[PDB]
Amino acid sequence: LLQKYVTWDDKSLFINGERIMIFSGEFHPFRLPVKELQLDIFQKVKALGFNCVSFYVDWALVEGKPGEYRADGIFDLEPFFDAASEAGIYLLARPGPYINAESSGGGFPGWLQRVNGTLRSSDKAYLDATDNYVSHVAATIAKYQITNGGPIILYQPENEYTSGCCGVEFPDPVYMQYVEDQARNAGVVIPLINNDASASGNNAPGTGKGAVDIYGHDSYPLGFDCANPTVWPSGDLPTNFRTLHLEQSPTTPYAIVQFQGGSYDPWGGPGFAACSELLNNEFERVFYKNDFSFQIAIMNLYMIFGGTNWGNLGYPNGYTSYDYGSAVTESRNITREKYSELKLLGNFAKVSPGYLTASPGNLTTSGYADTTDLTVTPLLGNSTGSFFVVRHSDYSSEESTSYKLRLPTSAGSVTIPQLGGTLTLNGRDSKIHVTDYNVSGTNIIYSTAEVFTWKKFADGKVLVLYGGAGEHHELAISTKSNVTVIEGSESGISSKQTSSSVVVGWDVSTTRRIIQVGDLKILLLDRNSAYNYWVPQLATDGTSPGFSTPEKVASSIIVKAGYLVRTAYLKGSGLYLTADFNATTSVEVIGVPSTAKNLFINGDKTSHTVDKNGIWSATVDYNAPDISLPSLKDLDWKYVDTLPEIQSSYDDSLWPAADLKQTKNTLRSLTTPTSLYSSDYGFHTGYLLYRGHFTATGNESTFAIDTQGGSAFGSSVWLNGTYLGSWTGLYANSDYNATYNLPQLQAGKTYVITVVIDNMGLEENWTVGEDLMKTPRGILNFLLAGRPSSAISWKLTGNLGGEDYEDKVRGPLNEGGLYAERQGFHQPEPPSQNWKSSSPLEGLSEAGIGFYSASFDLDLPKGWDVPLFLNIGNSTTPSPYRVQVYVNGYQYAKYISNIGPQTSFPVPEGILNYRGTNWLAVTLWALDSAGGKLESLELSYTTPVLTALGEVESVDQPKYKKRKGAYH
Numbered sequence: 001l002l003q004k005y006v007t008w009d010d011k012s013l014f015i016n017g018e019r020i021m022i023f024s025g026e027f028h029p030f031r032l033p034v035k036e037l038q039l040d041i042f043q044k045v046k047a048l049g050f051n052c053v054s055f056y057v058d059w060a061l062v063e064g065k066p067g068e069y070r071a072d073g074i075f076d077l078e079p080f081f082d083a084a085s086e087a088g089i090y091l092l093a094r095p096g097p098y099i100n101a102e103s104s105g106g107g108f109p110g111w112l113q114r115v116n117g118t119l120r121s122s123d124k125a126y127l128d129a130t131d132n133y134v135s136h137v138a139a140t141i142a143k144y145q146i147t148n149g150g151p152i153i154l155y156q157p158e159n160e161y162t163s164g165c166c167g168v169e170f171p172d173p174v175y176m177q178y179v180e181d182q183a184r185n186a187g188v189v190i191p192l193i194n195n196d197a198s199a200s201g202n203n204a205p206g207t208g209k210g211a212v213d214i215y216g217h218d219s220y221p222l223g224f225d226c227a228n229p230t231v232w233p234s235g236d237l238p239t240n241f242r243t244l245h246l247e248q249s250p251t252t253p254y255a256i257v258q259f260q261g262g263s264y265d266p267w268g269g270p271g272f273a274a275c276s277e278l279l280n281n282e283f284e285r286v287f288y289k290n291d292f293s294f295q296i297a298i299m300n301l302y303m304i305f306g307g308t309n310w311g312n313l314g315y316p317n318g319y320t321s322y323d324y325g326s327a328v329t330e331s332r333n334i335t336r337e338k339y340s341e342l343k344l345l346g347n348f349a350k351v352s353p354g355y356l357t358a359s360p361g362n363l364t365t366s367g368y369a370d371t372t373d374l375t376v377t378p379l380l381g382n383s384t385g386s387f388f389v390v391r392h393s394d395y396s397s398e399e400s401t402s403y404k405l406r407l408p409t410s411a412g413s414v415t416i417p418q419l420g421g422t423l424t425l426n427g428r429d430s431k432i433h434v435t436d437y438n439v440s441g442t443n444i445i446y447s448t449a450e451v452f453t454w455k456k457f458a459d460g461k462v463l464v465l466y467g468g469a470g471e472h473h474e475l476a477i478s479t480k481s482n483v484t485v486i487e488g489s490e491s492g493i494s495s496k497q498t499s500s501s502v503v504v505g506w507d508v509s510t511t512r513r514i515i516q517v518g519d520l521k522i523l524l525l526d527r528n529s530a531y532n533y534w535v536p537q538l539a540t541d542g543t544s545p546g547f548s549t550p551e552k553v554a555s556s557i558i559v560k561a562g563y564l565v566r567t568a569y570l571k572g573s574g575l576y577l578t579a580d581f582n583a584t585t586s587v588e589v590i591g592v593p594s595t596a597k598n599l600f601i602n603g604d605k606t607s608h609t610v611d612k613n614g615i616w617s618a619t620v621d622y623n624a625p626d627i628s629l630p631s632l633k634d635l636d637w638k639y640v641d642t643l644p645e646i647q648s649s650y651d652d653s654l655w656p657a658a659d660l661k662q663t664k665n666t667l668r669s670l671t672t673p674t675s676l677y678s679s680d681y682g683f684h685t686g687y688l689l690y691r692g693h694f695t696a697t698g699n700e701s702t703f704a705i706d707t708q709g710g711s712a713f714g715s716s717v718w719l720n721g722t723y724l725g726s727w728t729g730l731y732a733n734s735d736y737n738a739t740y741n742l743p744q745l746q747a748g749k750t751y752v753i754t755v756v757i758d759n760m761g762l763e764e765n766w767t768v769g770e771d772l773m774k775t776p777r778g779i780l781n782f783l784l785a786g787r788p789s790s791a792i793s794w795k796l797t798g799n800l801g802g803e804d805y806e807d808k809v810r811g812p813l814n815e816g817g818l819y820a821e822r823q824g825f826h827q828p829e830p831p832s833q834n835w836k837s838s839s840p841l842e843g844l845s846e847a848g849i850g851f852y853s854a855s856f857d858l859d860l861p862k863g864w865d866v867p868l869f870l871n872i873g874n875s876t877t878p879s880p881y882r883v884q885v886y887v888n889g890y891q892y893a894k895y896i897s898n899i900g901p902q903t904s905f906p907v908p909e910g911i912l913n914y915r916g917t918n919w920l921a922v923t924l925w926a927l928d929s930a931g932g933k934l935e936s937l938e939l940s941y942t943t944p945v946l947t948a949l950g951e952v953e954s955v956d957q958p959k960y961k962k963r964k965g966a967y968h
């Protein structure tokens, strides 16, 4: 429409005039703010066979102060985009402004609680608030479009603009058109795509004003019940998605912009390990192959890598981890079987252009397979090849089912297997069988075994096929040549030659076979062996793989290795692999160019041997050095009391007065004399403190108070130094009505009620019109019994300066309102030289909040990727306490003893300095009158990986400096 690089028709996108199946993964830059680790993820996605990444930008992190857009240092998108280019990954840009994303505010900054208008509407007040963010983010995105030689190919305005309520005329075409025009005005010319929350046709092509270019929708068919990871409920596998597609947007390629790749987990939930069990390899092979049955042309997995909700960036229902049970773990590892299984499907799609041109039919329980226990969805092509998606009709069935097929081919319709026996489908599995499959001029008449990849080399063609354990398979090839077994046993392989073909039956074995048929070699593998193969692009013009274009796709080699193969390139007589190893690994290379004499692995010349089939073999030795980690309990811990407010000497004259008579919040009108909503005063994040001054009459009995912090929040209350009590919190409570009994008060004396409240993050805004992101934080109601409420005069604080936030490097959400945070003592080199020596393992003996500081050195070896974790013990039922941990000033753990479930907090290299000094700052809030303490505090590691990654540069870690605007 507006450019010629990215076009489309009814079947697929075209990139530079060439069809492409977009297989993508969701990855949020703000959840992993270390540039070199961003490259790591990109390279791990490219190794799946993927060609694209989808990303959100969080507005709340980059416009914390209204009118000051800051996307610099750790929030800079440019290194993220350059890393995408370098890895060979296209991008789908999704800057919002609304992103949902289990993020604070759904991406909206807290100052939107002061906007006089419906959020996500055509109300001028809301739209004007978005203009500065969008003109900055979209101009940056504009500079990195594919039209300007960048990686960005698609843009998403808004997010799941799908349900409205409460007097909003949904869907508002004036709204979606304005949001679209914003992007275009900033120079975005690539196609716009939407992500309808269900397949409802909203803003599709043909709907007039506010229509996007490509209609997309999202789908989370297996749901979020991570507690029952083996239960696949009846009818939850979608079957009508093609039917809906043809009703809703038949002129554009079929697109699912967020397809389930994991699950969220709330405070108190079963944990993300459970989520990875639900959204595991079996889920992938059934549910993703099912999306291929609808001829999906654009497919993005939410999430491929989740990362971490550091510095309070997350929404109140979620905790620090955003692992998400995704194929790449929060600590960046790719050990989960779901990664390897996904690699098999992504590589198949990468080399199968006939998939895009075929004609999809409706699913059938007869015609193709000889039992109604199986479903077969055909995608039939007129000589470009066909594809048959086989699964159990009862999609959850764990039964083993025998069958035969009738499939139409160019050489007649054939009953398979021709040479005796039956095919098998074992439980929760799905197969993509193929017919007339083009391997660079060689025609595979059919194969029941699934294609992993194929390549044309100088010295012939190679095809890689796999099946699961215990299965019999059959293939047939258009040829005059004979079949011979060139590796492995002749036994178990049957064959038959006709005038224009050869048929070959084989049983799956753990031992690889290789057959040869003319100029085609075919690898016959079990699934588990196929897990260890990789298909990196072979660069000849440099070291980078480049994008997945037809040329560079064809110029790829096949590599059997272990943990990871990142890249390959040819330079003179050297073949250079870059790869990662988590054990001693046999490396085979198939397709070595004839000019290559030597093998290099991560720069090191490695001795190799060529076998009788031309395969290079070499071993890479794995010998991890000593990984020596400090004992955290034995550090020189320094303590300062971070609730000096409850001392009677405390002077709060510099605090903001909570004296606004009228709230700017349109969702909830005031039920107190003045606004005690934190966001009215610029305070959107971390712990909030309120101080209520009053003069006692001497008749005061009780103080009741309604505090609100979001799900799982806690609050504590003191009268001068007298602890009154705490709401210890529950996931079920986002507010709580407390009643406290006061001690006997002295008439005419002044007293101060100090209230500490955990702000868990701002709410999302999923339904347009409900304005739920405006749900306030702080004090909603109070009652000093027998006194008017104007008796109490309130002050409050959140993070120092509120929207004029101090720490421009670490962002507007990172720190909260505690004394130690306000002064900046959570940063490297605090002024702790005259503080008391005490450990958080000794802790507190009364209700209160302690702040603990210590440094520790690491000297971990270069060329090793070693995942590190902070561990807080919970071996027995604890007293109620809350902990934050800052690592060189960055908050990387929020811990609630009594709710959980997280005890293990990964912290990435770049935040941690692996060859240098590191600073821990721990806040310990004891919500109990006897105090509280940590049971244990430990640094640990998991399997070191011999890595190809370059030096991870430490992010900016500004040291402590006295802050002029502090309250002391």
Ligand SMILES: *[C@@H]1O[C@H](CO)[C@@H](O[C@@H]2O[C@H](CO)[C@@H](O[C@@H]3O[C@H](CO[C@H]4O[C@H](CO[C@H]5O[C@H](CO)[C@@H](O)[C@H](O)[C@@H]5O[C@H]5O[C@H](CO)[C@@H](O)[C@H](O)[C@@H]5O)[C@@H](O)[C@H](O[C@H]5O[C@H](CO)[C@@H](O)[C@H](O)[C@@H]5O)[C@@H]4O)[C@@H](O)[C@H](O[C@H]4O[C@H](CO)[C@@H](O)[C@H](O)[C@@H]4O[C@H]4O[C@H](CO)[C@@H](O)[C@H](O)[C@@H]4O[C@H]4O[C@H](CO)[C@@H](O)[C@H](O)[C@@H]4O)[C@@H]3O)[C@H](O)[C@H]2NC(C)=O)[C@H](O)[C@H]1NC(C)=O
Binding pocket: 276, 277, 278, 280, 281, 282, 334, 335, 336, 337, 340, 426, 468, 510, 528, 531, 532, 562, 563, 564, 582, 583, 943
């Ligand atoms: C270095 O990096 C590597 C990555 O490159 C990394 O390797 C990967 O490690 C992960 C673990 O982190 C692996 O994932 C697990 O795999 C388990 C094993 O099963 C898989 O493999 C077998 C094949 O096993 C043989 O071969 C291998 C390889 O040669 C050997 O190592 C084995 O020892 C074994 O050898 C025997 O057999 C050979 C021939 O077959 C013989 O030659 C040999 O002599 C031996 O006799 C396959 O059979 C499995 O397939 C079957 O099962 C799967 C999954 O159920 C089905 O989908 C499939 O259709 C088949 O039926 C399978 O591929 C898995 O058991 C394990 O699965 C569990 O965990 C995940 C969650 O992570 C769940 O999704 C899943 O549901 C399973 O959950 C159970 O277990 C968890 C506890 O962990 C419970 O929470 C849960 O409730 C559940 O328990 C219940 O069910 C169990 C049955 O499943 C039951 O036993 C329990 O008692 C209970 O009832 C998981 O997927 C991954 O495969 C590796 N990847 C690769 C490429 O190798 C390596 O570890 C790294 N190294 C280090 C040090 O870090």
Ligand SMILES: *[C@@H]1O[C@H](CO)[C@@H](O[C@@H]2O[C@H](CO)[C@@H](O[C@@H]3O[C@H](CO[C@H]4O[C@H](CO)[C@@H](O)[C@H](O[C@H]5O[C@H](CO)[C@@H](O)[C@H](O)[C@@H]5O)[C@@H]4O)[C@@H](O)[C@H](O[C@H]4O[C@H](CO)[C@@H](O)[C@H](O)[C@@H]4O[C@H]4O[C@H](CO)[C@@H](O)[C@H](O)[C@@H]4O[C@H]4O[C@H](CO)[C@@H](O)[C@H](O)[C@@H]4O)[C@@H]3O)[C@H](O)[C@H]2NC(C)=O)[C@H](O)[C@H]1NC(C)=O
Binding pocket: 271, 272, 273, 274, 277, 323, 329, 330, 331, 332, 333, 334, 335, 867, 869, 871, 872, 873, 875, 903, 904, 906, 936, 938, 940, 941, 942, 943
């Ligand atoms: C890939 O990336 C992943 C994400 O980054 C990463 O996964 C995370 O890994 C960390 C570290 O391993 C996990 O934290 C640990 O979890 C342990 C508890 O979970 C286990 O318990 C269940 C019941 O047995 C298992 O079923 C469960 O399996 C599930 O989870 C797996 C997740 O990978 C999955 O593969 C499985 O399929 C399945 O779904 C799980 O294995 C927990 O025990 C552990 O705490 C101990 O270790 C810490 C140090 O690392 C200590 O600080 C801590 O105090 C604990 O040590 C104590 O207890 C041990 C067991 O008794 C003893 O061996 C220790 O000596 C020590 O003992 C002292 O304390 C005892 C009190 O209990 C006392 O009795 C003793 O006397 C003594 O005083 C830790 O929290 C984290 O949960 C994972 N996160 C996610 C999201 O999964 C994965 O590792 C990465 N992989 C690679 C290869 O890199």
Ligand SMILES: *[C@@H]1O[C@H](CO)[C@@H](O[C@@H]2O[C@H](CO)[C@@H](O[C@@H]3O[C@H](CO)[C@@H](O)[C@H](O[C@H]4O[C@H](CO)[C@@H](O)[C@H](O)[C@@H]4O[C@H]4O[C@H](CO)[C@@H](O)[C@H](O)[C@@H]4O[C@H]4O[C@H](CO)[C@@H](O)[C@H](O)[C@@H]4O)[C@@H]3O)[C@H](O)[C@H]2NC(C)=O)[C@H](O)[C@H]1NC(C)=O
Binding pocket: 266, 267, 268, 269, 270, 730, 731, 732, 874, 876, 877, 878, 895, 896, 897, 898, 899, 900, 901, 902, 903
């Ligand atoms: C240290 O170790 C200790 C000791 O073992 C750990 O303490 C345990 O921690 C558990 C987790 O916090 C805690 O269990 C919880 O107890 C509460 C009741 O007090 C209960 O509400 C919890 O169950 C719900 O919530 C979780 C998520 O937090 C869900 O996964 C679960 O399915 C339940 O969800 C239901 O309620 C939610 C609340 O709104 C709903 O959002 C959700 O949709 C669902 O609703 C259904 O039920 C409602 C009625 O409940 C109904 O109205 C609605 O219509 C739906 O039907 C969970 O059981 C243990 O109590 C606690 N044990 C002890 C002895 O103290 C501690 O966590 C550890 N610490 C760390 C850091 O690991």
Ligand SMILES: OC[C@H]1O[C@@H](OC[C@H]2O[C@@H](O[C@H]3[C@H](O)[C@@H](O)[C@@H](O)O[C@@H]3CO)[C@H](O)[C@@H](O)[C@H]2O)[C@H](O)[C@@H](O)[C@H]1O
Binding pocket: 100, 101, 102, 160, 197, 198, 218, 220, 221, 222, 223, 224, 236, 258, 263, 264
């Ligand atoms: O990361 C969470 C993810 O949630 C997305 O909400 C998605 C979607 O969920 C549907 O619910 C599933 C349900 O869990 C299944 O049990 C079964 O019923 O299928 C349903 C889908 O039809 C909701 O019903 C649907 O409204 C929608 O909420 C969120 O949209 C996404 O941004 C992301 O946050």
Ligand SMILES: *[C@@H]1O[C@H](CO)[C@@H](O)[C@H](O)[C@H]1NC(C)=O
Binding pocket: 116, 663, 664, 665, 666
């Ligand atoms: C919002 O706008 C209306 C428009 O009539 C105005 O009268 C009022 O001052 C504003 N209200 C709030 C709560 O901000």
Ligand SMILES: *[C@@H]1O[C@H](CO)[C@@H](O)[C@H](O)[C@H]1NC(C)=O
Binding pocket: 243, 361, 362
């Ligand atoms: C396939 O599509 C529809 C919807 O599933 C089905 O009713 C019909 O029988 C099939 N189409 C034709 C032309 O037979």
Ligand SMILES: *[C@@H]1O[C@H](CO)[C@@H](O)[C@H](O)[C@H]1NC(C)=O
Binding pocket: 383, 384, 438, 439, 440, 441
């Ligand atoms: C098979 O692939 C070759 C390119 O290697 C192409 O020229 C040819 O047209 C293809 N044949 C079919 C039938 O698609």
Ligand SMILES: *[C@@H]1O[C@H](CO)[C@@H](O)[C@H](O)[C@H]1NC(C)=O
Binding pocket: 647, 648, 649, 650, 720, 746, 749, 750, 751, 752
């Ligand atoms: C309570 O605290 C305030 C200052 O926080 C102090 O001025 C006042 O004297 C204290 N009241 C009593 C009774 O000690």
Ligand SMILES: *[C@@H]1O[C@H](CO)[C@@H](O)[C@H](O)[C@H]1NC(C)=O
Binding pocket: 698, 699, 700, 701
């Ligand atoms: C406060 O005064 C009331 C009567 O007005 C009396 O009932 C109560 O006991 C008094 N003292 C308290 C609450 O300490």
Ligand SMILES: *[C@@H]1O[C@H](CO)[C@@H](O)[C@H](O)[C@H]1NC(C)=O
Binding pocket: 706, 733, 735, 736, 737, 781
């Ligand atoms: C607390 O009381 C307020 C005011 O009556 C009410 O709106 C709210 O529902 C109550 N909250 C809880 C958690 O019971």
Ligand SMILES: [Cl-]
Binding pocket: 819, 822, 823, 966, 967, 968
């Ligand atoms: Cl201060």
